[PDB]
Amino acid sequence: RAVPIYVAGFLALYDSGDPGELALDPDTVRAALPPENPLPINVDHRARCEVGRVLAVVNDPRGPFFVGLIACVQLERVLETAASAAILSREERLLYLITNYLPSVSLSTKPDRTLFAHVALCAIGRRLGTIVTYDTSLDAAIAPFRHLDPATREGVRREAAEAELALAGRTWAPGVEALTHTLLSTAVNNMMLRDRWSLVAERRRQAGIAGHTYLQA
Amino acid sequence: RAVPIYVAGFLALYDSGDPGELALDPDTVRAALPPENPLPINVDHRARCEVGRVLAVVNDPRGPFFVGLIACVQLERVLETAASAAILSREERLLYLITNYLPSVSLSTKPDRTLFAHVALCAIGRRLGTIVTYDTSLDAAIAPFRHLDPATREGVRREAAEAELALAGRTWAPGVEALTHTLLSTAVNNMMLRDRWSLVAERRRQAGIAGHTYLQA
Amino acid sequence: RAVPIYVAGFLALYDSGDPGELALDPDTVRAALPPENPLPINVDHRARCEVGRVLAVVNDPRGPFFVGLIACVQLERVLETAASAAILSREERLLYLITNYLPSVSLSTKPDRTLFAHVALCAIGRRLGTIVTYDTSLDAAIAPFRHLDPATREGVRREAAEAELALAGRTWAPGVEALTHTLLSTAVNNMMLRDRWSLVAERRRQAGIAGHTYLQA
Amino acid sequence: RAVPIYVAGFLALYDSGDPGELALDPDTVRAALPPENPLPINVDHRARCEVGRVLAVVNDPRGPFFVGLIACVQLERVLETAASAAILSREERLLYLITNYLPSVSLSTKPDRTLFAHVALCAIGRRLGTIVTYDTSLDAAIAPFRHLDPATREGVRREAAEAELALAGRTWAPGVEALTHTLLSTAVNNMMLRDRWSLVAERRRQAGIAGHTYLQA
């Protein structure tokens, strides 16, 4: 019943100019992989809102790149119904809705294999180039990433298939009201942002994302 | 328990440049006042979300001006809790939140006394100069309005005091989930709006709003 | 200077219902691979209009799938200038223009390795499911193909990279006037088609193409 | 060498339902006739492509009707050669081709005698009932028009004979490449038109065109 959605994007870009604290480097990422424990995916750090699971994190010459799976029907409905949409097809309407509402990732860290805590989908992340892609196929989710080492692609596909076998069939169900409140919060807390689409456009460029994306920026 | 909030603003400006359909003129407004029936105030036209009542609508030389009352504790909690706010005192926080989240009014019309149907608080209205002010005192809510005919002030104060006497003590209770779902909707349907704060700044100027407003534009 | 464009799509679907003559089967395709000689890519069978080269043809359980490269700047200009376009970005404008003008492939056959003669880009092909995809990356061109054996993907990527090494740097230049006349011909000869977009939509479905494609059907 | 082709049709219908701007009325047309200066005929408003001349424009009770002459051998060759035609006799092939490729007229206007600027042959015009007829005889070109005031016929024949005497022998020669580039453009800019033949069928009915026309709609 749930539309399995794949998210892909950089958790961080290595020499991007992230402030002192936020910055991530090759050796620290090297030491965090593979993660000791699975990285759950939640909405706007509200840890009650688990909606998926990070399948693979690969250290790309540009930064730690990841691929996740979101199998949550409540998240679908809550979004589908909120959209008193004027302006398609079907799950594409869903792709269009999640991409533009939740265009960024945000990695939380607690060096060793337990450094990476979890990833949160959000409107605007704190590190650069953190704009993600959503699609119903892993290959389709990673394709808009043109500045990606060939090895990263081949490795993220391999790990992601195995990883899927485990949580095969798992669906998350955080609670429609929990979901509803969490997304209102994502809006209310980002209302004071002067034109967020500039940042989106800018960070989409830094990530090397290009193509016929649903992202309207 | 509810913090009575006063909304004030122009429902429309007379010679502003509103498209054919939306345009309002002095004669039509003349004929519509006083309203046959009280004007309820709701959030984003979702009639289920009645949160207040329009006390006075005076035909100012510039356009139909209004003053309304919002007495809803659910709206307060729904907003207060969504704000995982970083960044003043108390109900001022409340003022700050609603002002920037729902900065515009929108008058629905069904000429005679039954023309004006209701007013909806919203992010961006379709008529110019429709930026409102919120405050815990009627006098405070109308003060930022500098291009206001002296008669309009004395008239809007007089009717408001009376009008309040009737719905004195009334508190609206649409239901927190209805509120929660309506506000997310306000957020989702306006996500593709490029910048928005420009329009808010422009239309604030048009209305002649000036002062130490919570409106961050 | 030329934008290398990748085309991908089925040259034919195995049990699709193609008329007696046009039909292709597994064993006949098996016997034609690898092609004795490279398969050039031309516009609407006008053999003077060579604009690219077929990189790989892989026998997929569904039909012979191929991946080609178009490196032609004249084709770019002729299209870019014809489009007195109302309605983006850049080479995407080019992607949008070539996809919707030339949405199909047409394989010409002269069984043995010399069966496959060449492929022609055209508006509407004669065999079913022959709707192609164009993109600036091979991976991005094949991603909209969801009903594709995993082996096909891994094989078409391997062959295509090697093949590219040979014609690396090759650009085609058929002649802008030749190009101009050939494309007018594509239009004039398909004018009598009652709604071609129905077929496009239909044959896009038969191919298992899905996603945020430039193809406006 | 050129095959003189006669075009006939309504430049506009009086009470058809043309949007605000495009709408034409009897008085304005009255004032515009006769045209101050001859009306050249071109392909798709590209003023470089003058291919004929409007002989008569008579104000019929239904709308401004016209009869024009097209004497251009390049247009003939450009069309004849583009058609890698499968599928009657000769100049009839020519009739068949132009009729279905450029089935509509479009009157550009700059009220006084200088209102009408020129008419452009095109695929789909913006005003209703603008479907034209082509033939090698004026009488043949106006015959399909059944809802035509008897006066209009006798008037349009009379002025046409005279008008011809002046531009008697004139043959236009825009240049085959100009022609070739203009026609591709006609094709590229109308590629996103869903169906088109419906509109052609509808507007043929509106004009009151009936008969054994080459127009395949």
Ligand SMILES: *P(=O)(OC(C)C)OC(C)C
């Ligand atoms: P993330 O990018 O934050 C990590 C640095 C913890 O963004 C949050 C604010 C949603």
Ligand SMILES: *P(=O)(OC(C)C)OC(C)C
């Ligand atoms: P209001 O300004 O609309 C009235 C014209 C009915 O704005 C709506 C779209 C929230």
Ligand SMILES: *P(=O)(OC(C)C)OC(C)C
């Ligand atoms: P192709 O699909 O034709 C082969 C069968 C030779 O289409 C042509 C008519 C463009």
Ligand SMILES: *P(=O)(OC(C)C)OC(C)C
């Ligand atoms: P015509 O009908 O346009 C006039 C109104 C100028 O059609 C053009 C768009 C070819």
